[PDB]
Amino acid sequence: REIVHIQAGQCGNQIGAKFWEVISDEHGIDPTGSYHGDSDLQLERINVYYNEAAGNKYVPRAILVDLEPGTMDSVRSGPFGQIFRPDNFVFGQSGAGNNWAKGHYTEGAELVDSVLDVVRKESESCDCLQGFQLTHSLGGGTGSGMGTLLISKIREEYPDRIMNTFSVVPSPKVSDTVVEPYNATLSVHQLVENTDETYCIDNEALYDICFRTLKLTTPTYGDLNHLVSATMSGVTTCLRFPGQLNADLRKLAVNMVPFPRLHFFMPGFAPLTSRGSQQYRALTVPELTQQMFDAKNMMAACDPRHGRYLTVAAVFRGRMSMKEVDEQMLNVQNKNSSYFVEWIPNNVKTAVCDIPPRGLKMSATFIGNSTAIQELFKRISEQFTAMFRRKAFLHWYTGEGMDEMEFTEAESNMNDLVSEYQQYQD
Amino acid sequence: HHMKVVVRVRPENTKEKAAGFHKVVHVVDKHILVFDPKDLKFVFDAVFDETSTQSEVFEHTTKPILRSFLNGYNCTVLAYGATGAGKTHTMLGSADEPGVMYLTMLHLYKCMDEIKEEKICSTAVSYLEVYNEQIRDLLVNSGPLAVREDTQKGVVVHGLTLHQPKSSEEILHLLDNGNKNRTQHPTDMNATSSRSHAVFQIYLRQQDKTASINQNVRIAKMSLIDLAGSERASTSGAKGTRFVEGTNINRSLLALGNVINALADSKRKNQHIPYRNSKLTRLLKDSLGGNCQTIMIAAVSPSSVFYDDTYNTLKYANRAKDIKSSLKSNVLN
Amino acid sequence: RECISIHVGQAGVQIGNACWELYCLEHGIQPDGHVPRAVFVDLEPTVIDEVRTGTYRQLFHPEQLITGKEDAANNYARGHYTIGKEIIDLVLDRIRKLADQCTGLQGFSVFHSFGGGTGSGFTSLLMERLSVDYGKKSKLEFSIYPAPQVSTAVVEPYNSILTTHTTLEHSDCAFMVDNEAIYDICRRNLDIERPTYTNLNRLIGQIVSSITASLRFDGALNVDLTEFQTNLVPYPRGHFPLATYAPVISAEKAYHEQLSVAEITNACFEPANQMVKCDPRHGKYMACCLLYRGDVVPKDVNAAIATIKTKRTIQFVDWCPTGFKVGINYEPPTVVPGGDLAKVQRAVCMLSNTTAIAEAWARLDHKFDLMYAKRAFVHWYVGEGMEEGEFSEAREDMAALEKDYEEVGVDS
Ligand SMILES: CC(=O)O[C@H]1C(=O)[C@@]2(C)[C@H]([C@H](OC(=O)c3ccccc3)[C@]3(O)C[C@H](OC(=O)[C@H](O)[C@@H](NC(=O)c4ccccc4)c4ccccc4)C(C)=C1C3(C)C)[C@]1(OC(C)=O)CO[C@@H]1C[C@@H]2O
Ligand SMILES: Nc1nc2c(ncn2[C@@H]2O[C@H](COP(=O)(O)OP(=O)(O)OP(=O)(O)O)[C@@H](O)[C@H]2O)c(=O)[nH]1
Ligand SMILES: Nc1ncnc2c1ncn2[C@@H]1O[C@H](COP(=O)(O)OP(=O)(O)NP(=O)(O)O)[C@@H](O)[C@H]1O
Ligand SMILES: Nc1nc2c(ncn2[C@@H]2O[C@H](COP(=O)(O)OP(=O)(O)O)[C@@H](O)[C@H]2O)c(=O)[nH]1
Ligand SMILES: [Mg+2]
Ligand SMILES: [Mg+2]
Ligand SMILES: [Zn+2]
Q1: Is position B46 annotated in a ligand binding site?
Q2: Domain total for chain B?
Q3: Atom 28 of ligand 2: nearest residue by CA position
Q4: What SS3 class is residue C346?
Q5: Domains of chain C
Q6: Order of strands across the sheet with A64-66?
Q7: CATH fold label, A1-258
């Protein structure tokens, strides 16, 4: 089986450097070097993310899509930056203006065909394709506009292969941009209707989970991104390992989406202990489910305690009893029968790999499909209307060849998407 | 009230004669039917026998259209049933027989013509298909026209061409262009399978005039729905485009089946019926969901292979009967 | 004489590697000896690859190891229809190539895991295509039906109401082993809160050895495979007896081992020992095939059973005078060199049809409805060449399996 990652925009790019920083060590792949793999198992399944050319040069099979040179020119000029075949860099030296319309209709729309070209070179690689990983932020031009286009085209070329999306939904408290709900409401719109698995991450839900669950006082971006990239490795690549009970992107999809909207999840890692001290090793297993199922520790902003679940997928990866796993999940389902929805007798999807995250004994990725994410598309959809009412920075969109009905459309769509998600919270 | 369910069968087919198998559904009376094994007696508002012609389907189907049109109530008509079962022979007609689309257009043209003076209508004609859940205008062949909502809400396709009926016959000529313009490919089951759902709508603003100036207008759009026949995996038997097309039909029909169950109970509570699930059900939200009346012509047939198809056509009848619509006014100023 | 085996689904293959392990272990055929007599099917390569990488590697032909590099999918439809279709021909070809080579066979011991994608869906058509190509044989399917509360897959019931209805009209006798009610045996009757899947597989890997292995082996009271479905099924529904083992003692803790027949037989009807969460809550037994092995006097049995026939709190069915197939083998059991199984010199692998599964089926059917009542994960099967038909019409199917297992008992 196989996948082809996609680094849309700067954020989705910056994260690409962290996703590949990680995964490669989780696969013994040095910069241009080969498989140094401490084991022999980190290689029978690598194909999922790489290609055979030389015999030491397994190249990451991703795409780097960006209208801002300086970005991909920082990712390519740094650490692992020299592993991507140059053919992967689909730059757009144009003005990467912070407009969703500037990266979806006017400036991104040109660069697309020179992207789809390569997304096909990589899909037609070999073996069988599974799907595509997509990283980006819903708060910018090249992220939410151009990266949401890339998928609307991917989902027309292979409506068979899956589409995981890792979105950096606009964080509440402070927005790292101004038009944010504009770039966002417009991309979530495309997402609800093309990708079929989304993992929404919040730069501040991370800061919290990175400043209190890691006593880490100076959580640089590299860190947030690192944490995120830790989950997306427990999702994909992980289940492309053996296991007593393994799954794969489809099992995860076919167990986690009760209704075709696509639905968006909220990833959570297991052993999230500060370095020295907290190395408590209280990781028997009740400690991992203790972790993953708390409020805090959900990379989403919203708190699960604020809304039922439809599905859960504890994708464990570390030798453990199929009894102390399958058991714990139950008491968890009964202690919290309140929030877990009822018309699914077993919400939880236990998954169990064998090999754990390189240096750790036992971990478990969490992929929650809670109705609590209603209280985020609410947030976004609010910020929209409060400014859309006055057409705030709208001239930057229309003046780029947009429509007054296009914003209407997306808000309403993604605003209905809130509605639906409540239909199951009840 | 509830949409009227009409059960329409087709003379014994070569396949049925070769099976020699009792008819799947035999009507004791035109209204009463017995389904096969068990001891199954269904009742309908109306049913038609295998002896019952398309011209009986004409009279019966168009009478509620007349009513709804004089009321200004939008008419919707759903031909449902698998491939082979008689949706096109009802809707289009036989080759010799006038079809319900011609007879209901003659009926509409009649409703406006009878009273030209009070009722001055404009007819616009919009024939579309839903192929792969993409909407395309049949009359303007182009790329699938973008889906928009109206300002308030309701989903409309922009760029569906209108025409006004020059004559009744002239609609048939253009409509046959629309009937070829939908995607079709031959199958083992049909001489020509419809790969798509086809939706003849018209925009009838019918100004009733009073006093010197003007009265109220009744607005009807009417809708003839030729659904594609369902196929199965084992029925398709061909992968590739044939499977993806057939799976795309089956997802849209499931979406519709979920909509019907949700209307019957869960909508009586709230919004929940999922109009969003298909492009057809998004436009059907302002069509049926906006106003009465609808009618479903469940085409069945007595073949043994059509047993699952026809049985689930009659399961669809029970689901559409479980749908109660209120009548709803439609007026413009 | 022989009985092929078709281990389908990852789990049906993990159990398969285990039942297949216990075999050579009691036949003196180390890693590289003879040739197996079975096949392995999965739509996920990485699992059958564990039989191609791990232990028992070269004991198989790469020809009896079918894989579909494509996708497993925890959904019946895909695994039956859409995907699992492409492989079936090739699959069959082995159970027609391996079925020819032999000498007057008796059937195929199928191994599948009810609530899976490759285990539910695919086998549904595999057993399907068998009941037509060899309607003249035995079709004993050994299942691992859904844990009563500790299911895994979110959809599980969709997959297991669909394997039951499609296989029902095609099996001869369906053995059942419940994954959770085995863990109770690992907690209560062996003491370990560390039961790897590798252990439940040693356990079914044991009960199963009592079925084929030793019974197809000479003894003082041999029992062919046909003998089962004859002495075990009262009615054509592919009736689903339950597997039970007796000396499930721990090879470390307690040691009373020397537990003469009179004890090991009584230890079968206590509900805490039956590899099934179908505790005889009311379910009248209707036929039991007590397979013994080891040092057993036929009078010890024709007395240890007589005592039981007169316990009355064990209430057998009315229309059944005597429903006790005594099967005696010679060779004692053969425990793993150092797993956790005691190692006695006699055992009782009793299996039986009980009106009790009137429960287990009910509780698994009700599951299905709750989700189907909302369509839940339905769009996952419809988009895979299924319909409102195959669900609703396989629900009605098992409905007359709740009435069947009710009418054949509870009444006189
Ligand atoms: C001596 C020792 O045991 O050190 C541990 C360690 O102290 C702790 C604190 C690690 C440490 O992680 C962090 O401090 C951290 C920093 C930024 C963002 C997120 C986390 C560690 O850096 C991370 C590192 O993780 C791994 O090696 C995994 O394979 C992990 N790898 C990476 O994230 C990675 C980092 C740099 C370069 C390449 C990859 C992984 C996890 C999931 C999927 C794939 C890979 C581990 C166990 C440790 C150190 C080294 C201190 C912890 O994190 C992880 C992801 O394991 C933080 O809480 C856990 C508990 C660990 O015990
Ligand atoms: N006893 C036992 N049960 C197992 C084993 N592996 C899995 N199971 C059970 O069987 C079911 C799991 O089926 P899966 O592994 O998800 O799927 P599969 O049937 O192999 O086929 P796919 O869904 O297509 O992967 C669950 O109910 C598990 O508890 C095993 O080795 N032994
Ligand atoms: N009531 C009828 N009387 C006589 N023949 C009929 C009748 N209805 C259908 N048939 C014939 O049966 C065949 C299939 O009818 P058709 O109306 O095309 O099926 P359908 O249900 O619309 N098929 P498809 O688009 O794939 O759904 C055609 O040759 C029809 O002429
Ligand atoms: N986690 C995370 N967020 C980022 C990174 N870079 C930008 N972001 C977030 O992305 C949003 C800004 O969009 P940006 O990535 O600049 O858009 P683009 O570059 O024009 O496509 C803000 O909400 C930031 O917090 C990053 O490296 N990691
Ligand atoms: Mg047709
Ligand atoms: Mg599997
Ligand atoms: Zn002793």
Answers
A1: no
A2: 1
A3: C152
A4: strand
A5: 1-241 (3.40.50.1440), 242-356 (3.30.1330.20), 357-412 (1.10.287.600)
A6: A89-91, A64-66, A6-8, A131-136, A162-167, A197-199, A264-268, A364-368, A312-317, A348-353
A7: Rossmann fold (3.40.50)
